[PDB]
Ligand binder design. Structure first.
Ligand SMILES: [Mg+2]
Ligand SMILES: [Mg+2]
Ligand SMILES: [Mg+2]
Ligand SMILES: [Mg+2]
Ligand SMILES: [Mg+2]
Ligand SMILES: [Mg+2]
Ligand SMILES: [Mg+2]
Ligand SMILES: [Mg+2]
Ligand SMILES: [Mg+2]
Ligand SMILES: [Mg+2]
Ligand SMILES: [Mg+2]
Ligand SMILES: [Mg+2]
Ligand SMILES: [Mg+2]
Ligand SMILES: [Mg+2]
Ligand SMILES: [Mg+2]
Ligand SMILES: [Mg+2]
Ligand SMILES: [Mg+2]
Ligand SMILES: [Mg+2]
Ligand SMILES: [Mg+2]
Ligand SMILES: [Mg+2]
Ligand SMILES: [Mg+2]
Ligand SMILES: [Mg+2]
Ligand SMILES: [Mg+2]
Ligand SMILES: [Mg+2]
Ligand SMILES: [Mg+2]
Ligand SMILES: [Mg+2]
Ligand SMILES: [Mg+2]
Ligand SMILES: [Mg+2]
Ligand SMILES: [Mg+2]
Ligand SMILES: [Mg+2]
Ligand SMILES: [Mg+2]
Ligand SMILES: [Mg+2]
Ligand SMILES: [Mg+2]
Ligand SMILES: [Mg+2]
Ligand SMILES: [Mg+2]
Ligand SMILES: [Mg+2]
Ligand SMILES: [Mg+2]
Ligand SMILES: [Mg+2]
Ligand SMILES: [Mg+2]
Ligand SMILES: [Mg+2]
Ligand SMILES: [Mg+2]
Ligand SMILES: [Mg+2]
Ligand SMILES: [Mg+2]
Ligand SMILES: [Mg+2]
Ligand SMILES: [Mg+2]
Ligand SMILES: [Mg+2]
Ligand SMILES: [Mg+2]
Ligand SMILES: [Mg+2]
Ligand SMILES: [Mg+2]
Ligand SMILES: [Mg+2]
Ligand SMILES: [Mg+2]
Ligand SMILES: [Mg+2]
Ligand SMILES: [Mg+2]
Ligand SMILES: [Mg+2]
Ligand SMILES: [Mg+2]
Ligand SMILES: [Mg+2]
Ligand SMILES: [Mg+2]
Ligand SMILES: [Mg+2]
Ligand SMILES: [Mg+2]
Ligand SMILES: [Mg+2]
Ligand SMILES: [Mg+2]
Ligand SMILES: [Mg+2]
Ligand SMILES: [Mg+2]
Ligand SMILES: [Mg+2]
Ligand SMILES: [Mg+2]
Ligand SMILES: [Mg+2]
Ligand SMILES: [Mg+2]
Ligand SMILES: [Mg+2]
Ligand SMILES: [Mg+2]
Ligand SMILES: [Mg+2]
Ligand SMILES: [Mg+2]
Ligand SMILES: [Mg+2]
Ligand SMILES: [Mg+2]
Ligand SMILES: [Mg+2]
Ligand SMILES: [Mg+2]
Ligand SMILES: [Mg+2]
Ligand SMILES: [Mg+2]
Ligand SMILES: [Mg+2]
Ligand SMILES: [Mg+2]
Ligand SMILES: [Mg+2]
Ligand SMILES: [Mg+2]
Ligand SMILES: [Mg+2]
Ligand SMILES: [Mg+2]
Ligand SMILES: [Mg+2]
Ligand SMILES: [Mg+2]
Ligand SMILES: [Mg+2]
Ligand SMILES: [Mg+2]
Ligand SMILES: [Mg+2]
Ligand SMILES: [Mg+2]
Ligand SMILES: [Mg+2]
Ligand SMILES: [Mg+2]
Ligand SMILES: [Mg+2]
Ligand SMILES: [Mg+2]
Ligand SMILES: [Mg+2]
Ligand SMILES: [Mg+2]
Ligand SMILES: [Mg+2]
Ligand SMILES: [Mg+2]
Ligand SMILES: [Mg+2]
Ligand SMILES: [Mg+2]
Ligand SMILES: [Mg+2]
Ligand SMILES: [Mg+2]
Ligand SMILES: [Mg+2]
Ligand SMILES: [Mg+2]
Ligand SMILES: [Mg+2]
Ligand SMILES: [Mg+2]
Ligand SMILES: [Mg+2]
Ligand SMILES: [Mg+2]
Ligand SMILES: [Mg+2]
Ligand SMILES: [Mg+2]
Ligand SMILES: [Mg+2]
Ligand SMILES: [Mg+2]
Ligand SMILES: [Mg+2]
Ligand SMILES: [Mg+2]
Ligand SMILES: [Mg+2]
Ligand SMILES: [Mg+2]
Ligand SMILES: [Mg+2]
Ligand SMILES: [Mg+2]
Ligand SMILES: [Mg+2]
Ligand SMILES: [Mg+2]
Ligand SMILES: [Mg+2]
Ligand SMILES: [Mg+2]
Ligand SMILES: [Mg+2]
Ligand SMILES: [Mg+2]
Ligand SMILES: [Mg+2]
Ligand SMILES: [Mg+2]
Ligand SMILES: [Mg+2]
Ligand SMILES: [Mg+2]
Ligand SMILES: [Mg+2]
Ligand SMILES: [Mg+2]
Ligand SMILES: [Mg+2]
Ligand SMILES: [Mg+2]
Ligand SMILES: [Mg+2]
Ligand SMILES: [Mg+2]
Ligand SMILES: [Mg+2]
Length: 272
RNA sequence: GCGGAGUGAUCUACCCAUGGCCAGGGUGAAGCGCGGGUAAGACCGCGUGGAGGCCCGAACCCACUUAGGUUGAAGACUGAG
RNA sequence: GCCAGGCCAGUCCGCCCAGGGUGAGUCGGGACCUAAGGCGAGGCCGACAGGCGUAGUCGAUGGACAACGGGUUGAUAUUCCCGUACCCGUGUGUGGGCGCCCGUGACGAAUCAGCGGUACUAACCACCCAAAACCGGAUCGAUCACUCCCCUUCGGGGGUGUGGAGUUCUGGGGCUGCGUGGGAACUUCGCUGGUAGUAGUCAAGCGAAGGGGUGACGCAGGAAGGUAGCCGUACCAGUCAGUGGUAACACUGGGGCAAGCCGGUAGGGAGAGCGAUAGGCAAAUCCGUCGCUCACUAAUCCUGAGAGGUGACGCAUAGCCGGUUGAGGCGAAUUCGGUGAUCCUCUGCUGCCAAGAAAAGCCUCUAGCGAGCACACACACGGCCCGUACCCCAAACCGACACAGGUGGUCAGGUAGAGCAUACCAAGGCGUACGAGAUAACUAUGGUUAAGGAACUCGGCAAAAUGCCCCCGUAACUUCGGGAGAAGGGGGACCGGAAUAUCGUGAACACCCUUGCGGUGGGAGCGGGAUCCGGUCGCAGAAACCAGUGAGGAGCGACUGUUUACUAAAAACACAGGUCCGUGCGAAGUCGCAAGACGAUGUAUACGGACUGACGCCUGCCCGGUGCUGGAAGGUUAAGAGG
RNA sequence: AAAUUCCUUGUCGGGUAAGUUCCGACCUGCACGAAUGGCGUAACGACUUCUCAACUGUCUCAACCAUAGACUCGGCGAAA
RNA sequence: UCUGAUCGUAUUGGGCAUCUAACCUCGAACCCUGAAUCGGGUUUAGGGACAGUGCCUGGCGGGUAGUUUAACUGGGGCGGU
RNA sequence: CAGCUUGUUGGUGGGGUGACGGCCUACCAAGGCGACGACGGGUAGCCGGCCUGAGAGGGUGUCCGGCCACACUGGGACUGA
RNA sequence: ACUGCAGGGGAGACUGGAAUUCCUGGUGUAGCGGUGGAAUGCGCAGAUAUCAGGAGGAACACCGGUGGCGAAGGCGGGUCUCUGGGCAGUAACUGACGCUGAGGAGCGAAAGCGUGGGGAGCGAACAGGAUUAGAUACCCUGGUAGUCCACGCCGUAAACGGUGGGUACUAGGUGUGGGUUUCCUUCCUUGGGAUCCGUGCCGUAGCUAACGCAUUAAGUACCCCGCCUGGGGAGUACGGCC
RNA sequence: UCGAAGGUGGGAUCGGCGAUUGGGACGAAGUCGUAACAAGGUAGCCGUACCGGAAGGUGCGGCUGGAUC
């Protein structure tokens, strides 16, 4: 699962890395790859809108099939499990019996060579994609969509899962990875099972260089700035900031969710 | 110093795309084998292997100390480290 | 040319004057392609100004694409000329081949009659229920009438037995139906004869829209096989350098040549047919997927550095003659080894995680077009636009200067050396622009120093010292990796012998066979390193240049890194790790009036903010204040309503 | 008794011939204290600080040599 | 009958519920469209008189802006006046 | 005190001894010792004997006798049976 | 070896009910909780109580015992999969292949440690109330780690039968468990008798200072291992291993 | 060549002193509490964790070397 480096250097002393034991076919599928380029956290104006971005290893995008709507009743065979630099889960390449190749998020327990079904008549097995109406309550699902046909949007990171609490009339109550209970329409599609690569959260990056490779740039604390730069700046020695904690633009801590967002009627219980 | 409207990222700060460069030595990680060990092991020793914000050190990038310069060769440099 | 300029002078000049000089189908670009990014028809947004952006169109620092050697001018040359190549296009002939119609072959339906799928289902058969209505059983309680019985103010209970419209369970045909299962004819579909081998389709060639494949990609590390270059050498042509020796292999010089074409080596890679087909915006014989057979260690095919041939009867060259010292003319030998890449095979191979452009181009499929086509040879032609002079670690560029500064890429020889360090040299350049003198102090840059050895000083600042290779040996502590080159020691030159395979590198003459760019033995010639023993010299053998000082105790920051261009490099910043808070998704946050964008082609193991800052042990008490989160009983409180 | 301690060269011990610095304690903390983290910590440092070996013109205490200037002659010829 | 408690036609506003048709959707499909992740239109699936916006109005608001922050004084500050 | 040894273990050919022998030397093998305690630390002359104890045993090595080791400390050769 | 027998022996996976708590809604108003007595605390902004639905973790009443199993520690909600051991019977097979075991190795309650998850209830630490001269406690109200899961670490308990393992022998009486066996075999009795393996109690001899042991010995003998030489200091110091 | 003595160096082992500091034993007729021996007033012990002037207290698991129906 996780391989620990040996303390041969100070940079490697405590670090660890995935063993990549689940990976076959170390190259991607040429027909499902699109170009990508970095932004450095800059928007269309050319200005930094997200801080601490840039550098980073070059990447290529792999088209993930997040809809899974048009292959109902058509079986697929899992051909490979591949590394993806754009997400924390691994991806599985599917060979459809119709001759088409697709990429999906690899669920937990979807070894190469398995058969994957879709539609209302599919069996309840990891990797099978069904509308929520046909999934029994208490199941663990992932890659759920908010609107019918809108594409999977929830529970997509490594190790994520959603528990189908129940379907009442035309809505399904879901326990979402944050712990918030939500309702979505029963016609929304979901995939059975939990997302794989669940142990990646235990990886110990060893040095600053590794995060620079992953594209994360250094972050400077507010209390070591000058007051013209940050509200926490100033002071003779080191201070705690001369006030209650605030953002670099002076906003205090507290809830930032819009108080009367339209979706409030779909949320049963806020997270802890 | 204040206001209005414009000009500047050929210097410099960061970022994006596409290219180039890093003499010569040293150390010897994982993994892979063989043998020892056992019921199996764990482990151990020999090889192979060639990792690393690894070591010494030119090009290259810097600028710690000191001497000189200080109407300078130079509006920030030279010599030795 | 010499009155300005050149840090002096100048007959000289990067200065002044006149004239001359830059030749491309292949070099670098355009006419080809796209990245980041720019502009942007319509468009969306915005009082106006304008912002953003789709189709599209630009934009190399990248992709694709055809040339090498020699000569020549005062000044250009892969451009001109000579020799020899390659790429794209056009015309003219010649030859055979396939096609239009003819027919050639092949493939190739449709009509209508015989039965079932009993699929349709009027009905019919079975399975449960309303099991309808109704006959009618047991129980219930305070209604009800009946007859038997009893107190009472004359109004009703009770033993309730019967049943009434009575509650519930249920005894019985469940006729009518519901739901399901079998299920009547034509009707949906199939077979046999039949329309009929008929209609009809395909069979030269081109397909550039569109589909598909390729193009197409990271970093690190070698190894093997090669080659360039370099060092010798067979052979060739010469020299006598006025010194003691040296007359020929003693010494000096030579000991060359490309693209292209042929070739298919070492090394690499590849299963082949047939059938089906929901997918690839239409189609597809293409791609993808699936099934079957055969094949698998082979064979075949592709790729492929090198070797060899040709290019080359040519060019070049050491040298020799004559030479206004310009041009001329002649012109030898050219073999075999060693060493050896930063280059080639190799867009390969191995390993790793941080997971590594696009489009054109090329190939292929069909849509489509199509009566003429495709090919071979020969001849004759067309190949456009811009750059090309000269400087280019500089006196010609950026620094006001002919300024000790700065400036990307390519080539890069010998001896010693690990080396692109360092010392001296080659090829090739240069002596660079004020000089000539003179033992003043003093300043600067170097050098040496008796005895002492940090006594100097804020402080060992500066200088001195250590320094290489090989062999021994190596502490506390430790996160077990380190500390460590710890510390501290020993040896090092030359000559000879071992020593003729001593050893190790490659492998000539000469040894077999599937005869080749083949295999084995073989050991010549040529290079390399180490050790032991004996001897020799010096003050000194790492010889010059070059080239770690080491140890012990504390503080701070874990570490590599970053920082005040021009007085501060640190204990400051960052960091991996930690906790808290926010964010349920065109999220929170940020830019923007807005549209829109980034976040992210991400989805709570994610993203943003704050503080702390490897690791180890831990992180105590306080919610009074102020923030944040949540609640709404009460008080207070705006516009509006009311008037 | 600290990058925090004014008094202050606090007191005791070590080191030195002689130690306001250094190291180990004491606790009388002017004015330490647990993520503006507390206490340690192998490795690392052109960081700050103390000691030792070796070495030396840093010094006792200076002396000599060469070069570039300074000095003389010819030419050009500024500046505050 | 200050009629507290109260009924039925008017009228009205406040809550709650439902609906769809205004309005909303970066849900989907098709056309403009030959090349289109823009835009617009058509249909559909949802939300829905909410939200958003205009005008009026209360709160909060070092996020930004313009400013103020006296004099005397055996120098100024401290104190005092 | 849990790992000790490299002339150390053995063999070969010489040298050396009065005499066998790594005793010494040149070459070859990788062996030899160790939990029945090597290697290391502390202590000590051994025995016949002496004392005590019914005995087994416990203590001790002085008179005397036997031997060993030493001659200021450390090292070496010669004469000689 | 073959045939039967009993079992909470162990591991994994799925799953069930009761109860507590919490959430939502209905009914509903002024108390609830707590003690020897109270107060802190909770509710009045709608609590306790009652109903219905949902969420979640822990533990499995009745069976259940004096019982069974396991080397010890320990072991029962149910089902399935995998697996260990024991007992009985035949004597089918080998033929002393046995016992103990220095060191060594493995297993090993609870508490605790590392990493991730989980957390209903309880509950060190901590806080408030109460008692008391004081109350850093006993009592009450709360409440963190922990108790739970996964993989590791730790190897300590009054880890006790305060009794090392193996074998042979030494009256009986009375319960229970698993077998087998003829007979009384219907005396239905699943009783009695015989044997083997256990598990309790009482009791003969013997042993013991006594208490007591007594076929499950602390009796009579043998073999092997471990341990003690008065009490503190001390199972502590130093050294060493983990 | 070997070879006593001597010098240089890093280590190994055994002791002595040491500012300061921890625990132990004994002393007197001190101060602060009553933890155990009774159900010792909250039963006592065993292993661990945490806390507090101190004896000790609390939690987890085990024993009776106590009692109860
Ligand atoms: Mg812009
Ligand atoms: Mg950030
Ligand atoms: Mg930071
Ligand atoms: Mg600052
Ligand atoms: Mg700024
Ligand atoms: Mg501010
Ligand atoms: Mg500050
Ligand atoms: Mg401060
Ligand atoms: Mg803070
Ligand atoms: Mg501040
Ligand atoms: Mg201005
Ligand atoms: Mg501009
Ligand atoms: Mg290197
Ligand atoms: Mg290895
Ligand atoms: Mg490095
Ligand atoms: Mg810098
Ligand atoms: Mg200076
Ligand atoms: Mg000067
Ligand atoms: Mg300098
Ligand atoms: Mg320098
Ligand atoms: Mg002139
Ligand atoms: Mg002049
Ligand atoms: Mg634009
Ligand atoms: Mg326009
Ligand atoms: Mg563009
Ligand atoms: Mg262009
Ligand atoms: Mg280019
Ligand atoms: Mg020229
Ligand atoms: Mg030509
Ligand atoms: Mg690609
Ligand atoms: Mg090679
Ligand atoms: Mg001569
Ligand atoms: Mg020669
Ligand atoms: Mg195919
Ligand atoms: Mg050739
Ligand atoms: Mg030119
Ligand atoms: Mg030129
Ligand atoms: Mg140029
Ligand atoms: Mg210039
Ligand atoms: Mg210059
Ligand atoms: Mg440069
Ligand atoms: Mg060279
Ligand atoms: Mg050089
Ligand atoms: Mg020279
Ligand atoms: Mg001169
Ligand atoms: Mg003079
Ligand atoms: Mg001297
Ligand atoms: Mg001297
Ligand atoms: Mg000194
Ligand atoms: Mg001094
Ligand atoms: Mg002095
Ligand atoms: Mg110095
Ligand atoms: Mg020096
Ligand atoms: Mg050394
Ligand atoms: Mg050290
Ligand atoms: Mg000599
Ligand atoms: Mg060095
Ligand atoms: Mg300290
Ligand atoms: Mg640092
Ligand atoms: Mg620290
Ligand atoms: Mg500076
Ligand atoms: Mg500086
Ligand atoms: Mg620095
Ligand atoms: Mg900084
Ligand atoms: Mg937003
Ligand atoms: Mg969070
Ligand atoms: Mg905070
Ligand atoms: Mg900090
Ligand atoms: Mg951080
Ligand atoms: Mg507070
Ligand atoms: Mg507060
Ligand atoms: Mg409060
Ligand atoms: Mg509030
Ligand atoms: Mg102090
Ligand atoms: Mg202080
Ligand atoms: Mg002091
Ligand atoms: Mg000093
Ligand atoms: Mg001190
Ligand atoms: Mg705190
Ligand atoms: Mg502080
Ligand atoms: Mg704090
Ligand atoms: Mg800190
Ligand atoms: Mg500290
Ligand atoms: Mg550094
Ligand atoms: Mg530093
Ligand atoms: Mg100090
Ligand atoms: Mg003069
Ligand atoms: Mg509205
Ligand atoms: Mg404000
Ligand atoms: Mg202001
Ligand atoms: Mg003003
Ligand atoms: Mg005043
Ligand atoms: Mg005054
Ligand atoms: Mg020998
Ligand atoms: Mg011998
Ligand atoms: Mg003695
Ligand atoms: Mg006796
Ligand atoms: Mg002696
Ligand atoms: Mg004497
Ligand atoms: Mg002697
Ligand atoms: Mg004699
Ligand atoms: Mg003799
Ligand atoms: Mg488990
Ligand atoms: Mg809860
Ligand atoms: Mg309620
Ligand atoms: Mg309730
Ligand atoms: Mg037999
Ligand atoms: Mg045993
Ligand atoms: Mg044992
Ligand atoms: Mg436990
Ligand atoms: Mg734990
Ligand atoms: Mg945890
Ligand atoms: Mg309290
Ligand atoms: Mg309690
Ligand atoms: Mg509680
Ligand atoms: Mg803890
Ligand atoms: Mg264990
Ligand atoms: Mg027990
Ligand atoms: Mg015994
Ligand atoms: Mg026994
Ligand atoms: Mg026994
Ligand atoms: Mg019995
Ligand atoms: Mg008894
Ligand atoms: Mg006894
Ligand atoms: Mg102990
Ligand atoms: Mg110890
Ligand atoms: Mg003392
Ligand atoms: Mg007591
Ligand atoms: Mg007690
Ligand atoms: Mg009491
Ligand atoms: Mg008690
Ligand atoms: Mg307590
Ligand atoms: Mg306890
Ligand atoms: Mg207990």
């Amino acid at each position: 699962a996780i391989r620990k480096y040996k303390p041969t250097t100070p940079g490697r002393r405590g670090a660890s890395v995935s063993d990549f034991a689940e990976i076959t076919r170390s190259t991607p599928e040429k027909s499902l790859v699109r170009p990508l380029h970095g932004r450095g956290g800059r928007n269309a104006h050319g200005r930094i809108t997200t801080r601490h971005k840039g550098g980073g290893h070059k990447r290529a995008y792999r088209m993930i099939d997040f809809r899974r709507n048009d292959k109902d009743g058509v079986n697929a065979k899992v051909a490979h499990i591949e590394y993806d630099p754009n997400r924390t889960a691994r991806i599985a390449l599917l060979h459809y019996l119709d001759g088409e190749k697709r990429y999906i998020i690899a669920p937990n327990g979807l070894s190469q060579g398995d058969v994957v079904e879709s539609g209302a008549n599919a069996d309840i097995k990891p990797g099978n994609n069904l509308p929520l109406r046909n999934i029994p309550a208490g199941t663990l699902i992932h890659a759920v969509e908010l609107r019918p046909g809108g594409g999977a949007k929830l529970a997509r990171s490594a190790g994520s899962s959603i528990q189908l609490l129940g379907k009442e009339a035309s809505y399904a109550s879901l326990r979402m990875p944050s712990g918030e209970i939500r309702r979505v329409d029963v016609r929304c599609r979901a995939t059975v099972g939990e997302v794989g690569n669940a142990e990646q959260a235990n990886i110990n990056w060893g040095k600053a260089g590794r995060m620079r490779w992953k594209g994360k740039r250094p972050s400077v604390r507010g209390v070591v700035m000058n007051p013209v730069d940050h509200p926490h700046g100033g002071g003779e020695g080191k201070t705690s900031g001369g006030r209650h904690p605030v953002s670099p633009w002076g906003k205090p801590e507290g809830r930032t969710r819009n108080a009367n967002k339209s979706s409030n009627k779909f949320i049963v219980r806020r997270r802890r």
